[PDB]
Amino acid sequence: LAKPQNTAEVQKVQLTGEPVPMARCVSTGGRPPAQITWHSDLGGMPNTSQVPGFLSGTVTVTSLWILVPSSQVDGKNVTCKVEHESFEKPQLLTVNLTVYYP
Amino acid sequence: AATSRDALPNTEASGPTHSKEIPALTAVETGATNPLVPSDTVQTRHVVQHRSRSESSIESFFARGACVTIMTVDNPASTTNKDKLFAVWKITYKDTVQLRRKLEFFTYSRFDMELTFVVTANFTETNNGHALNQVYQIMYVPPGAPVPEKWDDYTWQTSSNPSIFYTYGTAPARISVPYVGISNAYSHFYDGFSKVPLKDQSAALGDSLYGAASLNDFGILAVRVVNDHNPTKVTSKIRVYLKPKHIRVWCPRPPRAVAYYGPGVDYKDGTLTPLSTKDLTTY
Amino acid sequence: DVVVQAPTQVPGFLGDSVTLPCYLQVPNMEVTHVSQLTWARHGESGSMAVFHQTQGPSYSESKRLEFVAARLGAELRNASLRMFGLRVEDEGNYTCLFVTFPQGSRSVDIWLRVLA
Amino acid sequence: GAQVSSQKVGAHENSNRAYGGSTINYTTINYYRDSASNAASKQDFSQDPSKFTEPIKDVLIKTAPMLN
Amino acid sequence: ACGYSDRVLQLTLGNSTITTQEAANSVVAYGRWPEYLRDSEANPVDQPTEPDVAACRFYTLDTVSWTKESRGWWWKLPDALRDMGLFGQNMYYHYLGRSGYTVHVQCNASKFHQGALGVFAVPEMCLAGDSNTTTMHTSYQNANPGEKGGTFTGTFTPDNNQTSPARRFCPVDYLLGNGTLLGNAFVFPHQIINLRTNNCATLVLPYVNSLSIDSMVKHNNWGIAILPLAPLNFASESSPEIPITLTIAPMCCEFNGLRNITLPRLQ
Amino acid sequence: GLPVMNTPGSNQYLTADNFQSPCALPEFDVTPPIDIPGEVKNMMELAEIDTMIPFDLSATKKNTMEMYRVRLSDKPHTDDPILCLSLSPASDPRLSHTMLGEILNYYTHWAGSLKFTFLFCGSMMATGKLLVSYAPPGADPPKKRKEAMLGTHVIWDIGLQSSCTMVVPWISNTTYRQTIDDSFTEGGYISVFYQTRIVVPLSTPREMDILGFVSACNDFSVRLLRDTTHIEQKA
Amino acid sequence: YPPEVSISGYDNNWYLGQNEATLTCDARSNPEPTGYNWSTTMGPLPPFAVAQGAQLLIRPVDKPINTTLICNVTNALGARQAELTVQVKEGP
Ligand SMILES: *[C@@H]1O[C@H](CO[C@@H]2O[C@@H](C)[C@@H](O)[C@@H](O)[C@@H]2O)[C@@H](O[C@@H]2O[C@H](CO)[C@@H](O[C@@H]3O[C@H](CO)[C@@H](O)[C@H](O[C@H]4O[C@H](CO)[C@@H](O)[C@H](O)[C@@H]4O)[C@@H]3O)[C@H](O)[C@H]2NC(C)=O)[C@H](O)[C@H]1NC(C)=O
Ligand SMILES: *[C@@H]1O[C@H](CO[C@@H]2O[C@@H](C)[C@@H](O)[C@@H](O)[C@@H]2O)[C@@H](O[C@@H]2O[C@H](CO)[C@@H](O[C@@H]3O[C@H](CO)[C@@H](O)[C@H](O)[C@@H]3O)[C@H](O)[C@H]2NC(C)=O)[C@H](O)[C@H]1NC(C)=O
Ligand SMILES: *[C@@H]1O[C@H](CO)[C@@H](O[C@@H]2O[C@H](CO)[C@@H](O[C@@H]3O[C@H](CO)[C@@H](O)[C@H](O)[C@@H]3O)[C@H](O)[C@H]2NC(C)=O)[C@H](O)[C@H]1NC(C)=O
Ligand SMILES: *[C@@H]1O[C@H](CO)[C@@H](O[C@@H]2O[C@H](CO)[C@@H](O[C@@H]3O[C@H](CO)[C@@H](O)[C@H](O)[C@@H]3O)[C@H](O)[C@H]2NC(C)=O)[C@H](O)[C@H]1NC(C)=O
Ligand SMILES: *[C@@H]1O[C@H](CO)[C@@H](O[C@@H]2O[C@H](CO)[C@@H](O)[C@H](O)[C@H]2NC(C)=O)[C@H](O)[C@H]1NC(C)=O
Ligand SMILES: *[C@@H]1O[C@H](CO)[C@@H](O[C@@H]2O[C@H](CO)[C@@H](O)[C@H](O)[C@H]2NC(C)=O)[C@H](O)[C@H]1NC(C)=O
Ligand SMILES: CCCCCCCCCCCCCCCC(=O)O
Ligand SMILES: *[C@@H]1O[C@H](CO)[C@@H](O)[C@H](O)[C@H]1NC(C)=O
């Protein structure tokens, strides 16, 4: 197996009507692929996907956390959980949501 | 007149060369292998060769008994709910893999067959009861003859089938059989079917297995413990060893390189990677 | 009885190197002579690394595998094998066997889980 | 009806008034009417490999160009 | 002296002639030229039919196309010629038949192309099936494609439809479609069409079988397997293609047991 | 009766024995042979046939058609190896599954000369010279042309005769070698190098494959029949 | 986001002659609001209600008044507002 390492950013969102990606998580170079789950007080809809990784046999998973944006979520906390059988423990990555509004 | 135990050719001394003779250059597109010996491309000394190919003659490559099956039989108490077990084995060299792979270096063969039988027995219930020495009947039931349905029915009369009555604890039993094929040679591979499906007939009626034919149906061996039921159950195994003797073979083939998977040439997913990793420029 | 002693799974780091531990428990009551020890990949028509009591080591590709403990002349017990630069294609089930006497040959399977 | 044949002797004992030298023969007598019962004689023949190594219609002369 | 050459051949059988200017000699399988059945090896006693030039002549099968993705092709004999002129008619009107063949595989390209085809003639070319739940189940119809032949694949794909099984071969290329390694197929009679060297392969095949004569409709004596040992390439093009054409002539064919014509179920 | 005395071996069963035994089908009417083409008299006849070497057993090429292709290119001259192989015909993974290797795995001992023939499969417009080498054992295995060139070798000029054969002469301390990896009976090193470089004109593939074949010479023999590790039956 | 505005400071029991009570214009926006503006539903702030930045100081009243008050908050993104009717009576 290969120990991936991982990122999360917040995708800043306007006040679109549509459910859009508000936070991204990405575990690059996993073997076996990492498991990405989201936890937060305001659960949304996670869309996960994966491209082959760098070294043969690795996989990089890019999950993004899709939600219908709304003023009261700005500055709220969303946590990406990247789980993998090579970590000491499920590794927790946390984003500071951002929504611009009038 | 060259025999299998004759010495191979001597190496002749050969010196330096500079000419239009070009043994080293060739063209494998023709389908031929270049017949070179060392004196064609290096300087050689004279050597009187004594080695021979005596042990790789077809006869010697095959001169061994190989296990082709294990048959189980028993002799239980008469009070058993379960029937006394007699064994029935369809004769073949394809239930095991080692002899099969050696014969399959060739497409066709002819041989007399020597069969040797090793018989072993044991108690199975942790009991102290005993059993008296067993006699076994090994009956050859050729295709068409009535196969036994019970360990003691009339077929074991064997008026015409050959049978061996083997006594436990004596030298392993042994018989020879002639080349018995209905063809001029045994076929190790048959690229065909036993039925032509006809347009005017249902598909079910014209169907048959690929690669199968009675070319190789040789009937069965039926084996029983002749002794009546005993209060302590004894289980036995008959191991059958086949040695092909007086053998001829034809049309060489690449040997089986992935695991066998049934009596045909089929292969199974997950077994198709015989070669291991090795880098091109690593010794 | 002589029994071979190895983890069921080993991680396993991409681009790093790992040691696969494989050791022979041999109850000090009974004696055995272990002639050689062979690491093989799963069903590779034969061996990947082999060390021998007297003849020493031999590797498929020498540049990437190394017997950690096995030492020439000594009584062979520790088949532990270190392989460098793990890539994805290095994941798999590996067998490790010892060739003893008069016990025969005892072997075990190691899952090499490679992860990043 | 004995068949007497010679052995190809490999290791020779220190002897030439009984073993190693003065051709050592062996004897075979068949006991059965069926020839399938016979032992193998191992007195076998070799052949040229050409039907597999050179199955070309026009003869190969190795010192010459194969293609001409 | 006159300029005769290994590379330049003419083959004439019946009313047909083949020429080639880039041959690599030609192979006579196991050193045995085809022949009629000798009286000392004969078995059916009826006077045989021997069509001679009516059937012993070059028949060209449908051409196929070699690309960078081709894994290989296979045909069986006599099956690939079953619908060829009077050879096919004599085959189906008789219970028994035997025949040898001249097989000529054709594939030209240019001095800037590269690639190499192994052309193997295999006695009893039994191929593996597509099933992991039943063995020896390929149907007569799928085992006998006629002149279109079949293909090899780089991947074994088990048929999982147990309701209506496909019942066809799944011949994996590096296992020669039969469970043995392709690198060893050279112990079978063969030639290689390596485009820088030659543009054809010629194999003369004797009738081979464990019997003097047999059912041609039930049994194929020879298989022809063509696999790319080195892939097709050209200049720096991503999708080159060049055709491969098979032309086969029966030789010394004879038949016994004449009756009404066999009308086989082929679909 | 004639006084007799049973010796050791009595009633066994030695699987390599060679005795008479009663026939279970007396007076059977045996079908006669016919003259089938292709009869073989000695397994070594099969060993003398060229079969193709799976040279490239990398993790992604092994067990695919690509394992047989050795890729060359028109890159500038280098003294670094195209391929490196050990002369252990029954146990090096590249040789052990060739027809020669698979027959040698039914025997314990092998002896004699071998030969490697390479086929160039580039375009007709491609040229080049390569050096094929055999270094008998006991020194540093050749990793540079400078060392390989000091052993047995053939410099191959690519051209209309498509292929080139290097003979590996039987050079050995023992009279037979083992068919397993073994230092005492080690056979040495086979390697191929660029002698000049592959050259192509424009509009021509700059990369191409060579294929290699191995076969035994007429002085080759094997002995001590044994089972192979190349097939098994689990349970 | 644009300002979200409300006005706190009013318990319905404002009476004549009370002490200066002061209302805040609470607004939470991002980024922080740039401008506060105090007006009435009638236009100009009544004399008694003097604006102080983000707050409105409500002086003692001589006679009972109604005004509905408007806090117009400008932040970097837009400008929003909140309403509040406020009464001053005599009662006790
Ligand atoms: C290393 O070795 C382990 C150990 O197990 C053993 O070795 C294997 C190589 C293989 O030979 C095994 O048969 C052997 O016992 C390997 O891990 C095992 O792999 C097997 C088969 O792939 C797994 O089987 C699965 O077991 C699951 C529960 O444990 C079960 O849910 C699965 O069911 C599904 O798939 C089956 C077909 O396999 C199908 O019938 C069902 O319908 C369903 O879809 C399946 O049975 C085991 O999980 C593994 N065993 C253990 C103990 O972990 C391992 O694969 C190998 N290493 C690598 C890298 O491959
Ligand atoms: C401050 O404003 C109040 C009234 O406040 C009320 O709410 C506002 C938003 C507006 O809609 C006002 O019009 C509304 O009244 C003034 O006192 C109010 O005066 C009106 C008469 O002008 C009263 O009308 C009455 O309606 C009730 C039923 O609702 C009837 O029972 C009565 O008979 C009468 O018709 C209204 O009740 C009264 N409000 C209160 C609480 O008494 C107030 O005058 C003004 N400030 C001053 C002193 O000028
Ligand atoms: C998510 O991240 C944002 C910043 O990018 C956090 O906003 C910050 O929130 C804090 C209070 O929670 C504000 O701090 C206060 O600032 C004042 C000065 O204006 C100071 O006097 C106080 O002591 C206190 O520090 C801070 O101004 C604000 N940052 C910015 C740039 O406006 C938010 O709290 C985070 N939310 C979560 C759920 O983690
Ligand atoms: C069989 O031999 C192997 C290789 O010698 C042993 O593995 C390793 O041995 C070293 C040295 O004894 C152990 O490390 C020592 O431990 C610390 C950390 O715990 C390490 O930083 C130093 O190298 C230190 O000297 C190491 O833990 C051990 N590795 C493993 C995976 O076990 C092995 O212990 C032997 N096995 C048996 C069963 O005896
Ligand atoms: C998860 O998100 C992906 C990416 O946005 C979605 O993939 C889209 O699928 C839809 C519907 O099938 C297509 O019309 C789009 O073309 C795809 N978009 C992109 C950017 O590729 C997918 O629908 C989502 N998956 C699930 C299971 O909800
Ligand atoms: C929101 O997430 C932030 C991190 O982005 C959390 O901040 C951590 O807070 C703990 C104490 O609660 C500190 O020990 C860490 O050092 C902080 N991390 C960083 C990067 O500064 C915060 O606790 C979360 N709050 C909520 C309400 O979810
Ligand atoms: C009492 C013992 C009787 C033994 C009877 C032996 C019966 C004939 C067996 C023929 C074995 C054929 C082996 C080659 C099979 C093949 O064609 O593939
Ligand atoms: C609020 O204030 C802004 C800034 O001057 C002004 O332009 C806007 O029109 C005002 N809106 C209302 C409804 O008072």
Among candidates A91, A27, A84, which has minimal Cα distance to A53?
A: A27
Distance, in Å, from the CA atom of F171 to the CA atom of D22, rounded to the nearest integer, reads 34
Measured between CB atoms, does B239 come within 8 Å of chain F?
Answer: no
Nearest to E137 among B199, B206, B210 (CB): B210
Q: Please give the biggest Cα pair distance in chain C.
A: 44
Measured between CB atoms, does G3 come within 8 Å of chain A?
Answer: yes
Query: How many CB atoms neighbour CB E63 within 10 A?
Result: 11
Among candidates E192, F126, F56, which has minimal Cα distance to B33?
A: E192
Whether A1 and C116 have beta carbons less than 8 Å apart is answered as yes
Cα angle for residues B101, B105, B109 (degrees, 5° grid): 100
Tokens of A5: 């390492």
Cβ–Cβ below 8 Å for E196 and F162: yes
- Cα–Cα separations (whole angstroms), residue E256 to B212, B213, C49, E85, E260: 23, 21, 61, 18, 13
Pairing of strands E241-258, G14-15: unpaired
Query: How many CB atoms neighbour CB E255 within 10 A?
Result: 23
Q: Which ligand is nearest to the CA of C112?
A: 1
Whether G25 and G55 have beta carbons less than 8 Å apart is answered as yes
CA of B101 to the centre of ligand 1 (A): 29
Q: Which ligand is nearest to the CA of A64?
A: 5
> Which top CATH class is D1-68?
few secondary structures
What is chain G's Cα-based Rg? Answer: 14
Q: Which residues of B touch D52 (CB under 8 A)?
A: 33, 252
User: In this structure, what are the phi and psi dihedrals at residue E5, rounded to the nearest 5 degrees?
Assistant: -155, 145
Number of domains in chain G: 1
Q: Which ligand is nearest to the CA of C21?
A: 4
Output the ligand 3 site: residues, CB below 6 A: A 75-77, 96
Pairing of strands E200-205, E94-106: antiparallel
What does the domain layout of chain E look like in residue ranges? Answer: 1-267
Token pair 């690795």 is found at A58
**Ligand 1 atom showing the smallest separation from residue C93 Cα:** 1
- For residue G5, the SS3 value is strand
**Ligand 2 atom showing the smallest separation from residue G64 Cα:** 48
Token pair 């004549």 is found at G16
User: Domain range for residue F177?
Assistant: 1-235
Q: Where is chain G discontinuous (C–N over 2.5 Å), named by the preceding residue?
A: none
Cβ–Cβ below 8 Å for B192 and E265: no
Among candidates E229, F68, F41, D62, which has minimal Cα distance to B32?
A: D62
Cis? peptide before G31, omega within 30° of 0: yes
Distance, in Å, from the CA atom of F50 to the CA atom of F52, rounded to the nearest integer, reads 7
Tokens of A23: 């936070």
Distance, in Å, from the CA atom of E81 to the CA atom of E60, rounded to the nearest integer, reads 9
Distance, in Å, from the CA atom of B236 to the CA atom of B216, rounded to the nearest integer, reads 28
User: In this structure, what are the phi and psi dihedrals at residue B102, rounded to the nearest 5 degrees?
Assistant: -65, -45
Kindly state the helix (H) or strand (E) to which residue F44 belongs, with its residue range: helix F44-47
Give the torsion through C-alpha atoms of E34, E35, E36, E37, to 10 deg.
-100
- Cα–Cα separations (whole angstroms), residue G40 to A27, A101, G12, G26: 57, 26, 18, 17
Distance, in Å, from the CA atom of E100 to the CA atom of E208, rounded to the nearest integer, reads 8
Whether G and B touch, i.e. at least 3 CB pairs below 8 A, reads as no
- Domain E1-267, what fold? Jelly Rolls (2.60.120)
Query: How many CB atoms neighbour CB E141 within 10 A?
Result: 17
Distance, in Å, from the CA atom of B265 to the CA atom of F128, rounded to the nearest integer, reads 42
Specify which residues E204 forms β-bridges with.
Answer: E28, E102
* Residues whose CB falls within 8 Å of the CB of residue A49, separated by 6 or more in sequence, listed in order: A61, A62, A63
Tokens of E252: 């010394």
CA of A97 to the centre of ligand 3 (A): 13
Token pair 């190594």 is found at D53
Among candidates B104, B108, B251, which has minimal Cα distance to E32?
A: B251
* Residue type for position E254: E
Tokens of A100: 């611009």
Helices vs strands, H then E, count in chain C:
0, 11
Kindly state the helix (H) or strand (E) to which residue F14 belongs, with its residue range: none
Helices vs strands, H then E, count in chain B:
2, 10
The residue contributing the CA closest to ligand 1 atom 11 is C93
Q: Which residues of F touch D44 (CB under 8 A)?
A: 41-42
**Ligand 4 atom showing the smallest separation from residue C19 Cα:** 31
* Residue type for position E14: G
CA of A96 to the centre of ligand 3 (A): 11
Kindly state the helix (H) or strand (E) to which residue D50 belongs, with its residue range: helix D50-53
Cβ–Cβ below 8 Å for B278 and C60: yes
Query: How many CB atoms neighbour CB D60 within 10 A?
Result: 18
Q: Please give the biggest Cα pair distance in chain A.
A: 49
Whether B73 and B86 have beta carbons less than 8 Å apart is answered as yes
Query: How many CB atoms neighbour CB B65 within 10 A?
Result: 24
* Residue type for position F20: Q
Distance, in Å, from the CA atom of C57 to the CA atom of C51, rounded to the nearest integer, reads 4
The distance from CA B68 to its chain's CA centroid, rounded to whole angstroms, is: 6
Give the torsion through C-alpha atoms of G37, G41, G43, G44, to 10 deg.
-60
Q: Which residue of B has its CA nearest to F54?
A: B275
Query: How many CB atoms neighbour CB D34 within 10 A?
Result: 18
Distance, in Å, from the CA atom of E166 to the CA atom of E143, rounded to the nearest integer, reads 12
Measured between CB atoms, does F48 come within 8 Å of chain D?
Answer: yes
- Cα–Cα separations (whole angstroms), residue A49 to A5, A33, A64, A83, A94: 16, 11, 9, 15, 19
Q: Which residues of E touch F36 (CB under 8 A)?
A: 208-210
CA of B113 to the centre of ligand 7 (A): 7
Please give, rounded to a whole number of angstroms, the shortest distance from the CA of B187 to a CA of chain E.
6
User: Domain range for residue C22?
Assistant: 3-115
Distance, in Å, from the CA atom of F118 to the CA atom of E162, rounded to the nearest integer, reads 47
Cβ–Cβ below 8 Å for F122 and E112: no
Query: How many CB atoms neighbour CB F101 within 10 A?
Result: 26
Whether E211 and E204 have beta carbons less than 8 Å apart is answered as no
Instruction: Give, as one character, the DSSP assignment of residue B155.
Output: G
The residue contributing the CA closest to ligand 6 atom 27 is A77
Tokens of D32: 């059965």
Cβ–Cβ below 8 Å for F97 and B24: no
CA of F11 to the centre of ligand 8 (A): 118
Which ranges in chain E belong to alpha helices (H)? 85-93, 140-143
Residue E196: HSE in the Cβ half-sphere, 13 Å Cα cutoff = 28
* Residue type for position C19: T
Please give, rounded to a whole number of angstroms, the shortest distance from the CA of F59 to a CA of chain C.
6
Query: How many CB atoms neighbour CB C36 within 10 A?
Result: 22
Cβ–Cβ below 8 Å for E31 and D52: yes
Whether B245 and B63 have beta carbons less than 8 Å apart is answered as yes
Restricting to C residues 15-34, those with a Cβ less than 8 Å away from any Cβ of A are: 15
- Ranges of beta strands (E only) in E124-266 are 150-151, 190-194, 200-205, 222-234, 241-258
**DSSP of F95-112:** TTTSHHHHHHTTEEEEES
Distance, in Å, from the CA atom of B29 to the CA atom of E85, rounded to the nearest integer, reads 32
- Cα–Cα separations (whole angstroms), residue B128 to B76, B230, B232: 15, 13, 8
* Residues whose CB falls within 8 Å of the CB of residue E237, separated by 6 or more in sequence, listed in order: none
Q: Terminal CA-to-CA distance of chain C, rounded, Å?
A: 39
Nearest to E175 among B29, B181, B257 (CB): B257
Number of domains in chain C: 1
Which ranges in B7-108 belong to alpha helices (H)? 58-62, 98-103
- Ranges of beta strands (E only) in B132-271 are 135-141, 163-167, 173-177, 186-187, 220-225, 234-252
Distance, in Å, from the CA atom of B59 to the CA atom of B75, rounded to the nearest integer, reads 40
Q: Which residues of C touch A30 (CB under 8 A)?
A: 115-116
C6 lines ligand 4 (CB under 6 A): no
- Domain B1-283, what fold? Jelly Rolls (2.60.120)
* Exp. method: cryo-EM
* Residues whose CB falls within 8 Å of the CB of residue B161, separated by 6 or more in sequence, listed in order: B139, B140, B141, B142, B145
Token pair 């040279």 is found at F55
Distance, in Å, from the CA atom of B65 to the CA atom of B162, rounded to the nearest integer, reads 21
* Residues whose CB falls within 8 Å of the CB of residue F220, separated by 6 or more in sequence, listed in order: F44, F47, F48, F110, F111, F112, F113, F114
B247 lines ligand 7 (CB under 6 A): no
Kindly state the helix (H) or strand (E) to which residue C26 belongs, with its residue range: none
Output the ligand 1 site: residues, CB below 6 A: C 91-93, 111
Distance, in Å, from the CA atom of D60 to the CA atom of D54, rounded to the nearest integer, reads 7
Whether E254 and E37 have beta carbons less than 8 Å apart is answered as yes
Tokens of B95: 């239930």
Which ranges in C1-116 belong to alpha helices (H)? none
> Which top CATH class is A5-96?
mainly beta
Tokens of F161: 């005769």
Whether E74 and E127 have beta carbons less than 8 Å apart is answered as yes
Distance, in Å, from the CA atom of E84 to the CA atom of E89, rounded to the nearest integer, reads 8
* Residues whose CB falls within 8 Å of the CB of residue B204, separated by 6 or more in sequence, listed in order: none
Whether A67 and A19 have beta carbons less than 8 Å apart is answered as yes
Tokens of B93: 């060299």
CA of G67 to the centre of ligand 8 (A): 19
Q: Which ligand is nearest to the CA of B271?
A: 1
- Those residues of chain C whose CB sits closer than 8 Å to some CB in chain B are 41, 43-46, 48, 60-63
CA of A50 to the centre of ligand 1 (A): 24
- Cα–Cα separations (whole angstroms), residue G33 to G25, G53, G69: 11, 12, 19
Measured between CB atoms, does D40 come within 8 Å of chain E?
Answer: no
- Contacts E–F by Cβ distance under 8 A: 126
Distance, in Å, from the CA atom of B243 to the CA atom of G1, rounded to the nearest integer, reads 91
Using CB atoms, list chains with 3+ pairs below 8 Å to chain D. Answer: B, E, F
Q: Which residues of G touch A71 (CB under 8 A)?
A: 1, 4
* Residues whose CB falls within 8 Å of the CB of residue E78, separated by 6 or more in sequence, listed in order: E87, E91, E97, E99, E216, E220, E221, E250
Cβ–Cβ below 8 Å for F121 and E228: no
Please give, rounded to a whole number of angstroms, the shortest distance from the CA of F96 to a CA of chain C.
8
Number of domains in chain F: 1
User: In this structure, what are the phi and psi dihedrals at residue E141, rounded to the nearest 5 degrees?
Assistant: -60, -45
What is chain D's Cα-based Rg? Answer: 22
What is chain B's Cα-based Rg? Answer: 27
* Residue type for position F10: S
Distance, in Å, from the CA atom of F198 to the CA atom of D56, rounded to the nearest integer, reads 31
Among candidates E224, E217, E15, E215, which has minimal Cα distance to E101?
A: E224
Cα angle for residues A25, A29, A33 (degrees, 5° grid): 75
Please give, rounded to a whole number of angstroms, the shortest distance from the CA of F219 to a CA of chain D.
13
Using CB atoms, list chains with 3+ pairs below 8 Å to chain A. Answer: C, G
Whether E251 and E99 have beta carbons less than 8 Å apart is answered as yes
CA of C22 to the centre of ligand 4 (A): 12
Q: Which residue of B has its CA nearest to C46?
A: B276
User: In this structure, what are the phi and psi dihedrals at residue B67, rounded to the nearest 5 degrees?
Assistant: -70, 125
Q: CB-based burial of residue E17 (10 Å sphere; 0-12 exposed, 13-18 middle, 19+ buried)?
A: exposed
Whether F15 and B67 have beta carbons less than 8 Å apart is answered as no
CA of G72 to the centre of ligand 3 (A): 25
Distance, in Å, from the CA atom of G21 to the CA atom of G24, rounded to the nearest integer, reads 10
Q: Terminal CA-to-CA distance of chain G, rounded, Å?
A: 45
- For residue D47, the SS3 value is coil
